Structures are given as structure tokens and as C-alpha cells.
Amino acid sequence: ATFEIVNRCSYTVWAAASKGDAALDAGGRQLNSGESWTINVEPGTNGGKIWARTDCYFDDSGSGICKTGDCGGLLRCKRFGRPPTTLAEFSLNQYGKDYIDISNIKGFNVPMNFSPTTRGCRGVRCAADIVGQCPAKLKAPGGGCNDACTVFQTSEYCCTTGKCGPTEYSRFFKRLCPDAFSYVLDKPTTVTCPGSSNYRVTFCPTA
Structure with missing residues (x-):
């Protein structure tokens, strides 16, 4: 399947793509403002994730x-990347x-749109100013x-026992x-698309 990763932010991001035990495609790349990066993801890929990284410094290696x-x-x-990561x-x-879905379960860093470029389903988006509005304890x-969960490491926030409810913090994201997704047992916002669809992930879809 084809994923076009587009940085519409005014700042540079470093895109990343992984299924947790392996890179997807090249695994990561610098994207200047406006740049697009097209990757190929093997059919049958399970548990793939794409995210942006900010304020990176890399050497030659x-x-x-x-x-x-x-x-x-x-x-x-x-x-996978260290939170916070949309x-x-x-x-x-x-x-x-x-x-497909977008998740805030590991926090939020960059606003994002996740949409198919082929027919048969709808896209999803989280483009609100969550960083600007972020509760003091979560900044x-x-x-x-x-x-x-990242911050406080409790059974309730991390849903460790498989039983947990919404919280004041998860409701902020929601x-x-x-x-x-705002917490592990959130009512699913997963979108079902035809098998072998293609997609575009856009960072900063509105601004």
C-alpha cells in the first residue's frame, strides 16, 4: 500500500514509520515545510504507526x-517513538x-489528518490546539x-488490569x-476501509 506523508506545518518535522519491531520503508525522514514523502507498506502489515518527531538533531550516521x-x-x-506522539x-x-485510526493514547505533539486517497471510506483528524490548551501537569x-499514563504510571490511567474508565485527563483529549482514541478502553473511532487502500497522512492539516 502507498502512504504519502505530507508536512504542512511551518516547521520541519522528522516523519517516522514503524510496526514496532521493524521500520516501515526507510523508517524515517526529514520533511521540511511543504515536503511530501511517499512510502510503500507491505500488504498484511499489522500494527503499523506513523508519527512526527520535532526538534531533532542527527549526525552523518x-x-x-x-x-x-x-x-x-x-x-x-x-x-516506536517516545511520547508525546500523535x-x-x-x-x-x-x-x-x-x-485506520488516530490515537492520543500516547499524548499529542503535532496536529494530524489521516485520510484515504482511494474510495470507500472517510478520513479522521485531530487538528485542535491540544498543546496550547494542555493541562499544566501534562505539559x-x-x-x-x-x-x-506516561506521566503518572497508575493502573487507572494505563488501563493495566483491562478495566479502567475515562478520566479528567482523557476527557481533555476527547x-x-x-x-x-483518548484512553485504552475508549469507544473505538476506528475507520474500516477496503482492503489495499492507499492513504495520505498530513501534519498540520489546517495551519
Whole structure:
């Protein structure tokens, strides 16, 4: 499947694509304001994620650090990034269907639109100013808005026992972005697309 990753933000981001134990395509790339990066993702890919990283410094070998979304200091991510990270999530060709969503379960750093470029389903978006409105306790110094599990590490925020309810913190994310997962047991905002659809992820879709 084809994913075009587009940076409409006014600042540089470093895109990342991983299924957690391996890169997807090249795994990561710098995107200046306006730049588009097209990747190919193997059919049948399960648990793939795409996210942006901000304020990165890398050397010639592709090692360095980012203030949000860092994946063990690599330009080309093999694993998932350090929160806060707005997440585009997908599972492809699962019994004839693709499943996509946006998640705030690992916090928020960059606004995002996740849309198909082929027919048959709708896109999803979280483009509110969550960083600007972020509750004091959830603000990450490096930038972004942490989820409450990341910050407080309780069974209730992290849904460790598989039983947990909405919280004052999850409701903040849900209020600003209804179409994204706000906590683990959130009522699913997953979109079902035809198997083998193609997609576009746009950072800063409105501004």
C-alpha cells in the first residue's frame, strides 16, 4: 500500500514509520515545510504507526535525538517513538479490510489528518490546539502534551488490569479531538476501509 506523508506545518518535522519491531520503508525522514514523502507498506502489515518527531538533531550516521517522538536516537526508526506522539495507526488486509485510526493514547505533539486517497471510506483528524490548551501537569518541557499514563504510571490511567474508565485527563483529549482514541478502553473511532487502500497522512492539516 502507498502512504504519502505530507508536512504542512511551518516547521520541519522528522516523519517516522514503524510496526514496532521493524521500520516501515526507510523508517524515517526529514520533511521540511511543504515536503511530501511517499512510502510503500507491505500488504498484511499489522500494527503499523506513523508519527512526527520535532526538534531533532542527527549526525552523518543518522544518530541523534528528538524532543518528541524519539525512537532510540535513530533517524530511521526501527521501533516506536517516545511520547508525546500523535499517532496514525493502521492494520492492512485484515480479512479483506483495512483499519485506520488516530490515537492520543500516547499524548499529542503535532496536529494530524489521516485520510484515504482511494474510495470507500472517510478520513479522521485531530487538528485542535491540544498543546496550547494542555493541562499544566501534562505539559512536556520539550514540547507536546503527555497522556496521563506516561506521566503518572497508575493502573487507572494505563488501563493495566483491562478495566479502567475515562478520566479528567482523557476527557481533555476527547473534548478537543472526538475522533481520536483518548484512553485504552475508549469507544473505538476506528475507520474500516477496503482492503489495499492507499492513504495520505498530513501534519498540520489546517495551519
